[PDB]
Protein backbone atom coordinates (compact mmCIF):
# COMPACT_ATOMS: atom_id res chain seq x y z
CA UNK A 1 0.00 0.00 0.00
CA UNK A 2 2.67 2.24 0.74
CA UNK A 3 3.36 5.19 2.95
CA UNK A 4 1.39 8.86 2.88
CA UNK A 5 2.33 11.18 0.23
CA UNK A 6 5.55 13.17 0.64
CA UNK A 7 8.46 14.50 -1.58
CA UNK A 8 11.38 12.53 -2.32
CA UNK A 9 14.63 11.78 0.50
CA UNK A 10 17.85 11.92 -0.94
CA UNK A 11 20.09 9.79 0.97
CA UNK A 12 20.86 10.01 4.88
CA UNK A 13 20.12 13.52 4.51
CA UNK A 14 16.47 12.93 3.28
CA UNK A 15 14.33 16.21 2.46
CA UNK A 16 16.68 18.31 4.08
CA UNK A 17 16.37 19.97 0.82
CA UNK A 18 12.40 20.60 0.95
CA UNK A 19 12.43 21.37 4.13
CA UNK A 20 12.37 25.33 5.40
CA UNK A 21 14.75 27.38 6.81
CA UNK A 22 12.37 28.78 9.82
CA UNK A 23 12.32 25.58 11.16
CA UNK A 24 10.46 21.93 11.56
CA UNK A 25 6.96 23.86 11.95
CA UNK A 26 7.09 26.22 8.87
CA UNK A 27 8.86 23.20 7.28
CA UNK A 28 5.41 20.61 8.02
CA UNK A 29 2.93 23.74 7.14
CA UNK A 30 4.77 24.65 3.56
CA UNK A 31 4.83 20.48 2.83
CA UNK A 32 1.01 20.44 3.93
CA UNK A 33 0.05 22.78 1.21
CA UNK A 34 1.88 20.56 -2.01
CA UNK A 35 1.01 17.15 -0.29
CA UNK A 36 -2.02 17.44 1.85
CA UNK A 37 -3.03 17.40 5.51
CA UNK A 38 -1.42 13.57 5.44
CA UNK A 39 2.21 13.60 4.35
CA UNK A 40 5.60 11.78 4.88
CA UNK A 41 8.69 13.66 5.68
CA UNK A 42 12.31 12.39 6.12
CA UNK A 43 14.24 13.76 8.66
CA UNK A 44 17.31 12.25 7.62
CA UNK A 45 17.07 8.51 7.36
CA UNK A 46 14.01 8.96 9.35
CA UNK A 47 10.07 8.23 8.16
CA UNK A 48 7.89 10.40 9.90
CA UNK A 49 4.38 10.51 9.21
CA UNK A 50 3.10 14.10 9.55
CA UNK A 51 -0.68 14.82 10.55
CA UNK A 52 -2.43 18.28 9.88
CA UNK A 53 -5.38 19.74 10.81
CA UNK A 54 -8.05 18.49 13.08
CA UNK A 55 -9.96 15.97 11.47
CA UNK A 56 -6.33 14.30 10.28
CA UNK A 57 -5.05 14.42 13.82
CA UNK A 58 -8.35 12.62 15.71
CA UNK A 59 -9.21 10.07 12.85
CA UNK A 60 -5.72 8.84 14.26
CA UNK A 61 -5.31 10.12 17.82
CA UNK A 62 -8.91 9.40 18.76
CA UNK A 63 -10.62 6.72 16.69
CA UNK A 64 -7.31 4.62 15.99
CA UNK A 65 -6.41 6.06 19.43
CA UNK A 66 -4.86 2.24 19.85
CA UNK A 67 -2.56 2.18 17.11
CA UNK A 68 -0.92 5.59 17.49
CA UNK A 69 -0.44 5.56 21.21
CA UNK A 70 3.42 4.34 20.68
CA UNK A 71 6.25 7.32 22.10
CA UNK A 72 8.82 8.36 19.84
CA UNK A 73 12.66 9.70 21.11
CA UNK A 74 13.40 13.66 20.95
CA UNK A 75 16.97 14.29 19.50
CA UNK A 76 18.55 16.66 22.43
CA UNK A 77 16.84 14.61 25.48
CA UNK A 78 16.68 11.43 24.19
CA UNK A 79 20.29 10.84 25.64
CA UNK A 80 19.14 11.77 29.14
CA UNK A 81 16.23 9.84 29.05
CA UNK A 82 16.96 6.75 26.52
CA UNK A 83 13.16 5.53 26.42
CA UNK A 84 13.22 5.81 30.40
CA UNK A 85 10.72 7.24 32.76
CA UNK A 86 6.62 8.38 32.16
CA UNK A 87 6.59 10.41 29.53
CA UNK A 88 9.11 8.48 26.83
CA UNK A 89 8.48 5.25 28.76
CA UNK A 90 7.18 2.84 26.23
CA UNK A 91 4.83 -0.40 25.86
CA UNK A 92 4.66 -2.07 29.36
CA UNK A 93 7.14 0.51 31.04
CA UNK A 94 4.84 3.47 30.30
CA UNK A 95 1.19 1.45 31.01
CA UNK A 96 2.61 1.12 34.23
CA UNK A 97 4.46 3.72 34.55
CA UNK A 98 1.68 5.99 33.65
CA UNK A 99 -0.84 3.72 35.76
CA UNK A 100 1.67 4.65 38.99
CA UNK A 101 2.18 8.37 38.59
CA UNK A 102 -1.36 9.02 37.64
CA UNK A 103 -2.56 7.29 40.25
CA UNK A 104 0.05 8.50 42.72
CA UNK A 105 -0.91 12.43 42.37
CA UNK A 106 -4.22 11.15 43.13
CA UNK A 107 -3.45 9.96 46.51
CA UNK A 108 -2.24 13.62 47.03
CA UNK A 109 -4.53 15.74 45.47
CA UNK A 110 -5.11 15.15 42.09
CA UNK A 111 -8.52 14.62 43.25
CA UNK A 112 -8.54 18.41 42.65
CA UNK A 113 -9.43 19.68 46.68
CA UNK A 114 -5.63 19.07 48.76
CA UNK A 115 -4.28 20.35 45.40
CA UNK A 116 -6.81 23.12 45.08
CA UNK A 117 -5.91 24.34 48.72
CA UNK A 118 -2.45 24.34 47.75
CA UNK A 119 -2.52 26.11 44.25
CA UNK A 120 -4.83 28.79 45.91
CA UNK A 121 -2.65 28.86 48.83
CA UNK A 122 0.43 29.26 46.35
CA UNK A 123 -1.11 32.19 44.70
CA UNK A 124 -1.85 33.79 47.99
CA UNK A 125 1.61 33.73 48.35
CA UNK A 126 2.50 35.09 44.58
CA UNK A 127 0.20 38.32 45.82
CA UNK A 128 1.69 39.20 49.15
CA UNK A 129 5.24 38.40 47.07
CA UNK A 130 3.73 40.50 43.99
CA UNK A 131 2.36 43.51 46.43
CA UNK A 132 5.42 43.77 48.43
CA UNK A 133 7.12 44.68 45.05
CA UNK A 134 5.16 47.87 45.24
CA UNK A 135 4.15 47.17 41.76
CA UNK A 136 7.88 48.35 39.78
CA UNK A 137 9.27 46.46 36.70
CA UNK A 138 10.07 42.83 36.88
CA UNK A 139 10.42 39.78 34.57
CA UNK A 140 7.68 37.64 35.44
CA UNK A 141 9.64 34.19 34.04
CA UNK A 142 11.51 33.18 37.22
CA UNK A 143 8.33 34.26 39.64
CA UNK A 144 5.50 32.26 37.26
CA UNK A 145 7.77 29.31 36.78
CA UNK A 146 7.64 28.99 41.01
CA UNK A 147 3.90 29.37 41.09
CA UNK A 148 3.09 26.34 38.96
CA UNK A 149 6.18 24.58 40.36
CA UNK A 150 5.70 24.38 43.80
CA UNK A 151 2.18 22.62 42.89
CA UNK A 152 4.07 19.61 41.27
CA UNK A 153 6.52 20.04 44.37
CA UNK A 154 3.84 19.40 46.55
CA UNK A 155 3.11 16.18 45.40
CA UNK A 156 6.33 14.74 44.26
CA UNK A 157 8.33 16.10 46.76
CA UNK A 158 6.13 17.32 49.53
CA UNK A 159 7.80 20.12 50.47
CA UNK A 160 7.18 23.50 48.94
CA UNK A 161 10.40 26.31 48.23
CA UNK A 162 10.73 30.22 49.05
CA UNK A 163 10.57 32.06 45.99
CA UNK A 164 13.97 33.51 46.74
CA UNK A 165 15.63 30.00 48.01
CA UNK A 166 19.00 30.13 46.44
CA UNK A 167 18.58 25.83 45.42
CA UNK A 168 15.10 26.63 44.40
CA UNK A 169 15.90 29.47 41.82
CA UNK A 170 19.15 27.61 40.49
CA UNK A 171 16.21 24.89 39.29
CA UNK A 172 13.85 26.84 37.79
CA UNK A 173 16.54 28.75 35.83
CA UNK A 174 17.71 25.47 34.35
CA UNK A 175 14.02 24.62 33.52
CA UNK A 176 14.09 27.81 31.54
CA UNK A 177 17.36 27.44 29.62
CA UNK A 178 16.41 23.70 29.10
CA UNK A 179 13.18 24.68 27.09
CA UNK A 180 14.62 27.54 25.33
CA UNK A 181 17.83 25.56 24.34
CA UNK A 182 15.30 22.55 23.73
CA UNK A 183 13.20 24.70 21.23
CA UNK A 184 16.39 26.38 19.74
CA UNK A 185 16.89 26.35 15.92
CA UNK A 186 20.37 23.98 16.38
CA UNK A 187 17.67 21.16 18.33
CA UNK A 188 15.66 20.94 15.30
CA UNK A 189 18.74 20.50 13.34
CA UNK A 190 19.92 18.03 15.91
CA UNK A 191 16.86 16.23 15.70
CA UNK A 192 17.80 15.67 11.50
CA UNK A 193 21.73 14.72 11.63
CA UNK A 194 21.94 13.89 15.64
CA UNK A 195 24.36 10.92 14.45
CA UNK A 196 26.80 13.44 13.49
CA UNK A 197 26.49 15.97 15.15
CA UNK A 198 26.33 14.19 18.54
CA UNK A 199 30.58 13.86 18.34
CA UNK A 200 30.48 17.78 18.64
CA UNK A 201 29.75 20.62 21.04
CA UNK A 202 26.94 22.34 20.46
CA UNK A 203 23.41 23.01 22.51
CA UNK A 204 22.41 19.30 23.10
CA UNK A 205 25.40 19.51 24.94
CA UNK A 206 24.52 22.31 27.57
CA UNK A 207 21.06 20.56 27.26
CA UNK A 208 23.00 16.90 28.68
CA UNK A 209 24.27 19.17 31.59
CA UNK A 210 21.46 20.85 32.15
CA UNK A 211 18.90 18.49 33.10
CA UNK A 212 21.36 16.23 34.33
CA UNK A 213 22.19 18.91 37.33
CA UNK A 214 18.43 18.30 37.82
CA UNK A 215 18.87 14.82 37.98
CA UNK A 216 21.37 14.60 40.61
CA UNK A 217 18.93 17.45 42.60
CA UNK A 218 16.04 14.97 42.07
CA UNK A 219 18.60 11.45 43.24
CA UNK A 220 19.45 13.86 46.37
CA UNK A 221 16.17 14.21 47.45
CA UNK A 222 15.23 10.59 46.54
CA UNK A 223 18.03 9.56 49.39
CA UNK A 224 16.68 12.45 51.67
CA UNK A 225 14.07 10.72 51.65
CA UNK A 226 14.88 6.87 51.54
CA UNK A 227 16.11 7.62 54.91
CA UNK A 228 13.25 8.92 56.61
CA UNK A 229 10.20 6.51 54.47
CA UNK A 230 7.71 5.87 57.22
CA UNK A 231 5.95 3.24 55.34
CA UNK A 232 2.26 3.98 57.14
CA UNK A 233 2.62 7.48 56.21
CA UNK A 234 3.77 7.97 52.34
CA UNK A 235 4.63 11.78 52.13
CA UNK A 236 4.86 12.22 48.26
CA UNK A 237 5.46 10.77 44.82
CA UNK A 238 8.66 9.76 45.70
CA UNK A 239 7.92 7.50 48.68
CA UNK A 240 4.76 5.53 47.02
CA UNK A 241 7.31 4.68 44.40
CA UNK A 242 10.11 3.92 47.06
CA UNK A 243 7.08 1.80 48.54
CA UNK A 244 6.08 0.05 45.39
CA UNK A 245 9.83 -0.55 44.99
CA UNK A 246 9.85 -2.30 48.29
CA UNK A 247 6.46 -4.18 47.76
CA UNK A 248 9.09 -5.94 44.66
CA UNK A 249 12.32 -7.27 46.70
CA UNK A 250 12.83 -9.89 44.00
CA UNK A 251 10.43 -9.08 41.02
CA UNK A 252 13.80 -8.24 38.64
CA UNK A 253 11.17 -7.39 35.84
CA UNK A 254 9.44 -4.69 37.94
CA UNK A 255 9.31 -1.61 35.58
CA UNK A 256 9.99 0.09 39.02
CA UNK A 257 13.88 0.87 39.05
CA UNK A 258 16.17 3.55 40.28
CA UNK A 259 16.26 4.44 36.73
CA UNK A 260 12.85 4.96 36.71
CA UNK A 261 12.23 6.98 39.40
CA UNK A 262 14.95 9.46 38.87
CA UNK A 263 13.56 9.96 35.51
CA UNK A 264 9.59 10.07 35.90
CA UNK A 265 10.45 12.51 38.86
CA UNK A 266 12.33 14.82 36.21
CA UNK A 267 9.47 14.13 33.75
CA UNK A 268 6.56 15.30 36.02
CA UNK A 269 9.24 17.97 37.31
CA UNK A 270 10.27 19.71 34.48
CA UNK A 271 6.53 19.08 32.62
CA UNK A 272 4.69 20.56 35.17
CA UNK A 273 7.03 23.28 36.04
CA UNK A 274 7.60 24.31 32.94
CA UNK A 275 4.58 24.79 30.50
CA UNK A 276 2.00 25.62 32.56
CA UNK A 277 4.16 28.72 33.42
CA UNK A 278 5.06 29.42 30.30
CA UNK A 279 1.11 29.44 29.32
CA UNK A 280 0.87 31.83 32.35
CA UNK A 281 3.37 34.10 30.94
CA UNK A 282 2.01 34.02 27.16
CA UNK A 283 -0.92 35.01 28.66
CA UNK A 284 -0.54 38.10 30.52
CA UNK A 285 1.10 39.47 27.67
CA UNK A 286 -1.67 39.27 25.48
CA UNK A 287 -3.42 40.78 28.65
CA UNK A 288 -1.59 43.24 27.98
CA UNK A 289 -1.54 43.57 24.59
CA UNK A 290 -5.63 43.51 24.87
CA UNK A 291 -6.70 45.31 27.70
CA UNK A 292 -10.38 45.59 27.01
CA UNK A 293 -10.42 42.11 27.51
CA UNK A 294 -8.33 42.50 30.62
CA UNK A 295 -11.05 44.72 32.35
CA UNK A 296 -13.80 42.51 30.91
CA UNK A 297 -11.81 39.78 32.54
CA UNK A 298 -11.93 41.21 35.77
CA UNK A 299 -15.63 42.83 35.64
CA UNK A 300 -16.51 38.60 35.86
CA UNK A 301 -14.08 37.83 39.08
CA UNK A 302 -16.17 40.71 40.23
CA UNK A 303 -19.65 40.09 39.48
CA UNK A 304 -19.31 36.30 40.31
CA UNK A 305 -15.80 35.94 42.69
CA UNK A 306 -16.01 39.62 44.41
CA UNK A 307 -13.21 40.72 46.25
CA UNK A 308 -13.42 39.61 49.67
CA UNK A 309 -12.37 35.65 48.79
CA UNK A 310 -9.77 33.99 46.81
CA UNK A 311 -10.69 32.53 43.39
CA UNK A 312 -12.17 28.95 43.72
CA UNK A 313 -12.48 26.20 41.02
CA UNK A 314 -16.15 25.81 40.74
CA UNK A 315 -16.02 29.72 40.04
CA UNK A 316 -14.77 29.04 36.42
CA UNK A 317 -17.79 27.42 35.82
CA UNK A 318 -19.67 30.75 36.29
CA UNK A 319 -17.79 32.83 34.00
CA UNK A 320 -18.00 31.82 30.91
CA UNK A 321 -15.90 34.52 29.89
CA UNK A 322 -13.03 34.52 31.64
CA UNK A 323 -12.90 30.40 30.80
CA UNK A 324 -12.70 31.64 27.14
CA UNK A 325 -9.95 34.36 27.48
CA UNK A 326 -7.69 31.19 29.03
CA UNK A 327 -8.74 28.93 26.18
CA UNK A 328 -7.81 31.69 23.68
CA UNK A 329 -4.63 32.17 25.60
CA UNK A 330 -3.96 28.59 25.58
CA UNK A 331 -4.87 28.08 22.12
CA UNK A 332 -2.31 30.86 20.23
CA UNK A 333 -0.35 30.36 23.10
CA UNK A 334 0.94 26.71 21.12
CA UNK A 335 3.49 25.80 23.46
CA UNK A 336 3.81 22.70 22.26
CA UNK A 337 3.76 23.38 18.28
CA UNK A 338 4.03 19.62 16.98
CA UNK A 339 3.08 17.73 20.07
CA UNK A 340 5.38 14.65 21.39
CA UNK A 341 6.85 12.64 19.13
CA UNK A 342 4.15 9.60 18.39
CA UNK A 343 4.53 6.18 17.04
CA UNK A 344 2.09 3.57 15.69
CA UNK A 345 2.94 0.05 17.46
CA UNK A 346 1.01 -1.91 15.26
CA UNK A 347 1.06 -1.79 11.21
CA UNK A 348 -1.54 0.58 10.91
CA UNK A 349 -4.44 0.94 7.50
CA UNK A 350 -4.71 4.99 7.82
CA UNK A 351 -6.81 7.03 5.21
CA UNK A 352 -6.03 4.10 2.52
CA UNK A 353 -2.08 3.97 3.42
CA UNK A 354 -0.77 1.57 5.68
CA UNK A 355 2.49 2.59 8.09
CA UNK A 356 4.89 0.42 8.94
CA UNK A 357 5.05 -0.56 12.61
CA UNK A 358 6.98 1.65 14.81
CA UNK A 359 6.88 4.50 12.08
CA UNK A 360 7.23 7.77 14.01
CA UNK A 361 3.89 9.95 13.40
CA UNK A 362 4.01 13.94 14.42
CA UNK A 363 0.36 15.30 15.55
CA UNK A 364 0.62 19.34 14.21
CA UNK A 365 -1.30 19.88 17.41
CA UNK A 366 -0.51 23.70 16.45
CA UNK A 367 -2.11 22.42 13.01
CA UNK A 368 -5.64 22.14 15.01
CA UNK A 369 -5.46 25.03 17.22
CA UNK A 370 -5.48 27.15 13.95
CA UNK A 371 -7.92 25.51 11.52
CA UNK A 372 -9.79 27.45 9.70
CA UNK A 373 -12.39 24.74 9.52
CA UNK A 374 -12.80 24.54 12.84
CA UNK A 375 -11.88 28.41 13.68
CA UNK A 376 -13.34 32.01 12.66
CA UNK A 377 -10.26 34.10 12.17
CA UNK A 378 -7.65 31.61 13.59
CA UNK A 379 -4.97 34.02 13.32
CA UNK A 380 -6.33 36.74 16.23
CA UNK A 381 -6.77 36.19 19.62
CA UNK A 382 -10.32 35.50 20.29
CA UNK A 383 -12.22 34.70 22.39
CA UNK A 384 -15.05 34.03 20.86
CA UNK A 385 -14.16 31.20 19.46
CA UNK A 386 -15.27 29.52 22.49
CA UNK A 387 -18.92 31.34 23.14
CA UNK A 388 -22.26 30.87 21.79
CA UNK A 389 -24.59 33.79 20.74
CA UNK A 390 -25.88 33.52 24.72
CA UNK A 391 -22.45 34.12 25.89
CA UNK A 392 -21.88 30.98 27.04
CA UNK A 393 -18.69 28.47 26.85
CA UNK A 394 -18.80 26.51 23.58
CA UNK A 395 -16.74 23.59 23.21
CA UNK A 396 -14.88 23.62 19.82
CA UNK A 397 -13.40 20.20 18.30
CA UNK A 398 -10.02 21.86 17.03
CA UNK A 399 -9.18 22.96 20.63
CA UNK A 400 -6.19 20.12 21.68
CA UNK A 401 -3.37 21.50 23.52
CA UNK A 402 -3.20 18.66 25.85
CA UNK A 403 -3.31 16.26 22.82
CA UNK A 404 -5.86 13.76 22.43
CA UNK A 405 -5.49 9.86 22.52
CA UNK A 406 -4.40 7.17 25.14
CA UNK A 407 -1.49 9.30 25.56
CA UNK A 408 -2.60 13.15 26.45
CA UNK A 409 -1.32 14.98 29.74
CA UNK A 410 -1.87 13.88 32.66
CA UNK A 411 -1.36 17.53 33.43
CA UNK A 412 -4.69 18.24 31.75
CA UNK A 413 -6.07 18.32 35.03
CA UNK A 414 -3.95 20.29 37.17
CA UNK A 415 -2.49 22.39 34.47
CA UNK A 416 -6.02 23.73 33.51
CA UNK A 417 -6.55 24.41 37.18
CA UNK A 418 -3.33 26.41 37.93
CA UNK A 419 -4.12 28.09 34.77
CA UNK A 420 -7.54 29.00 35.77
CA UNK A 421 -6.61 30.03 39.64
CA UNK A 422 -3.69 31.69 39.03
CA UNK A 423 -5.13 34.07 36.04
CA UNK A 424 -8.14 35.06 38.21
CA UNK A 425 -5.89 35.63 41.98
CA UNK A 426 -3.53 37.95 40.21
CA UNK A 427 -6.20 39.50 37.98
CA UNK A 428 -8.14 39.88 41.15
CA UNK A 429 -5.72 42.35 43.22
CA UNK A 430 -3.03 43.65 40.50
CA UNK A 431 -4.03 45.27 37.03
CA UNK A 432 -1.14 44.53 34.44
CA UNK A 433 0.31 47.66 32.57
CA UNK A 434 3.94 47.60 30.68
CA UNK A 435 6.21 50.59 28.80
CA UNK A 436 5.06 49.00 25.41
CA UNK A 437 1.94 49.81 24.65
CA UNK A 438 -0.82 47.14 23.28
CA UNK A 439 -0.35 48.49 19.97
CA UNK A 440 4.17 47.76 19.68
CA UNK A 441 3.23 43.94 21.90
CA UNK A 442 5.18 41.05 20.06
CA UNK A 443 3.79 37.79 20.17
CA UNK A 444 6.16 36.24 18.13
CA UNK A 445 8.26 33.67 20.00
CA UNK A 446 11.64 34.01 20.65
CA UNK A 447 12.11 30.98 20.00
CA UNK A 448 9.91 28.85 17.55
CA UNK A 449 10.80 24.67 17.33
CA UNK A 450 9.61 21.40 19.74
CA UNK A 451 8.19 23.76 22.85
CA UNK A 452 7.51 28.00 21.82
CA UNK A 453 8.98 30.06 24.12
CA UNK A 454 7.39 33.48 23.92
CA UNK A 455 9.48 36.31 24.18
CA UNK A 456 10.86 37.85 27.71
CA UNK A 457 8.46 41.57 28.48
CA UNK A 458 8.67 44.01 31.32
CA UNK A 459 5.55 44.15 33.21
CA UNK A 460 4.23 45.78 36.63
CA UNK A 461 1.21 44.17 38.82
CA UNK A 462 -0.26 47.27 40.33
CA UNK A 463 -1.99 46.53 43.82
CA UNK A 464 -6.45 47.20 43.52
CA UNK A 465 -8.77 48.87 46.13
C1 LIG B 1 -0.37 24.16 30.03
C2 LIG B 1 0.19 23.12 30.66
C3 LIG B 1 0.58 21.82 29.91
C4 LIG B 1 0.46 21.57 28.60
C5 LIG B 1 -0.09 22.50 27.51
C6 LIG B 1 0.96 20.23 28.37
C7 LIG B 1 1.01 19.59 27.15
C8 LIG B 1 1.35 18.27 26.96
C9 LIG B 1 1.46 17.58 25.68
C10 LIG B 1 1.24 18.22 24.30
C11 LIG B 1 1.80 16.31 25.94
C12 LIG B 1 2.06 15.17 24.93
C13 LIG B 1 0.94 15.05 23.91
C14 LIG B 1 1.02 13.69 23.29
O1 LIG B 1 1.53 12.75 23.96
O2 LIG B 1 0.57 13.53 22.13
C15 LIG B 1 1.91 16.16 27.37
C16 LIG B 1 2.24 14.98 28.00
C17 LIG B 1 2.57 14.81 29.32
N1 LIG B 1 2.48 15.77 30.32
FE1 LIG B 1 2.09 17.78 29.90
N2 LIG B 1 1.37 19.70 29.57
C18 LIG B 1 1.16 20.65 30.55
C19 LIG B 1 1.44 20.50 31.90
C20 LIG B 1 1.78 19.33 32.54
C21 LIG B 1 1.75 19.11 33.98
C22 LIG B 1 1.32 20.15 35.03
C23 LIG B 1 2.16 17.85 34.21
C24 LIG B 1 2.30 17.13 35.57
C25 LIG B 1 2.06 17.73 36.74
C26 LIG B 1 2.46 17.25 32.93
C27 LIG B 1 2.91 15.96 32.74
C28 LIG B 1 2.89 15.26 31.55
C29 LIG B 1 3.30 13.88 31.38
C30 LIG B 1 3.83 12.92 32.45
C31 LIG B 1 3.08 13.59 29.89
C32 LIG B 1 3.35 12.27 29.14
C33 LIG B 1 2.18 11.30 29.29
C34 LIG B 1 2.46 10.14 28.37
O3 LIG B 1 3.49 10.19 27.66
O4 LIG B 1 1.66 9.16 28.37
N3 LIG B 1 2.22 18.17 31.93
N4 LIG B 1 1.63 17.36 27.97
C1 LIG C 1 6.14 22.01 28.81
O1 LIG C 1 6.18 20.94 29.32
C2 LIG C 1 7.46 22.28 28.13
C3 LIG C 1 8.22 20.99 27.96
C4 LIG C 1 7.60 19.87 27.41
C5 LIG C 1 8.30 18.68 27.26
C6 LIG C 1 9.63 18.61 27.65
C7 LIG C 1 10.40 17.34 27.49
C8 LIG C 1 9.53 16.33 26.74
C9 LIG C 1 10.77 16.81 28.87
C10 LIG C 1 11.66 17.64 26.70
C11 LIG C 1 10.26 19.73 28.20
C12 LIG C 1 9.55 20.92 28.35
Given at each position: ????????????????????????????????????????????????????????????????????????????????????????????????????????????????????????????????????????????????????????????????????????????????????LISSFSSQVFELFSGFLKYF???????????????????????????????????????????????????????????????????????????????????????????????????????????????????????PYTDAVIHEIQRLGDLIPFG???????????????????????????????????????????????????????????FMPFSLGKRICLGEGIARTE???????????????????????????????????????????????
Amino acid sequence: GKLPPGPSPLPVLGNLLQMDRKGLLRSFLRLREKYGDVFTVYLGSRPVVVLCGTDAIREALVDQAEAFSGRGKIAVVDPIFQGYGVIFANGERWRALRRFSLATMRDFGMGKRSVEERIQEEARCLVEELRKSKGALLDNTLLFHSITSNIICSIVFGKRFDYKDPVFLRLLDLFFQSFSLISSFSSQVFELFSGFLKYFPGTHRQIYRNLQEINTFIGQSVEKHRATLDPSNPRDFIDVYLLRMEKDKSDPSSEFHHQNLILTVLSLFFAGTETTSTTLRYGFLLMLKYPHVTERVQKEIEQVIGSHRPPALDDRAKMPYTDAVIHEIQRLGDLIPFGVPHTVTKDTQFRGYVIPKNTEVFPVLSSALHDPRYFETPNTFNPGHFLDANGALKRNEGFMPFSLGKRICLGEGIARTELFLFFTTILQNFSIASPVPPEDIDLTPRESGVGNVPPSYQIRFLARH
